[PDB]
């Protein structure tokens, strides 16, 4: 995640193993139950896309759901690209590039790039955009997996 250091700057720090394991354990115990979404939300505080793929990729089991989510993440990403067209002409030397759906999904962007966008002024909340897609896709799952 990207956290604020004592000095008063935003720097990246790694997520903790008993945080990781707590994510694992939630999924083990409460599967598709709604409490998973606030839980997720708390444990995703200050998290990167990269950390969010890590969390999704580290799941075991419920592979039908994991595939449905993936496909929702790509749909929501396809929709990001649709709604926000690429911008006019070449990229400025003085500036950094606008993200695509795949940069938001973490796929085409690097960590330093993910830190550029979030730490820069104005900052862009690529975590929160992926977060809604995850929560939206979580609703899809919850609604389906209701019996």
């Amino acid at each position: 995640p990207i956290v604020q250091n004592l000095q008063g700057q935003m720097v990246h720090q790694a997520i903790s193993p008993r945080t990781l394991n707590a994510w694992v354990k939630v999924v083990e115990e409460k599967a598709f139950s709604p409490e998973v979404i606030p839980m997720f939300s708390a444990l995703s505080e200050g998290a990167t896309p990269q950390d969010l793929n890590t969390m999704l990729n580290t799941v075991g089991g419920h592979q039908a759901a994991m595939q449905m989510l993936k496909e929702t993440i790509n749909e929501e990403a396809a929709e990001w690209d649709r709604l926000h067209p690429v911008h006019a002409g070449p990229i400025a030397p003085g500036q950094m590039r606008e993200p695509r759906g795949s940069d938001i999904a973490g796929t085409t962007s690097t960590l330093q790039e993910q830190i550029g966008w979030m730490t820069h002024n104005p900052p862009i909340p690529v975590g929160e955009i992926y977060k809604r897609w995850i929560i939206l896709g979580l609703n899809k799952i919850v609604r389906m997996y209701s019996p």
Partner: protein
Amino acid sequence: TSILDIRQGPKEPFRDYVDRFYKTLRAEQASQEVKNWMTETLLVQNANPDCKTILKALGPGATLEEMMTACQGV
């Protein structure tokens, strides 16, 4: 399971049923006004005859502690 499929048993305490209702209501995502409509309507409708009878005597305007204490012996 759908919210319409939530019903009270013939021997099931209302209490255990009301818990089931707001759990399933907890998985419904509808507007609050619709969920208010579901509350006053569906809960009583799928309640068992013995308690159903009881709840009809509370009249309208009733709140959950009074419903929950009203159908306790049933």
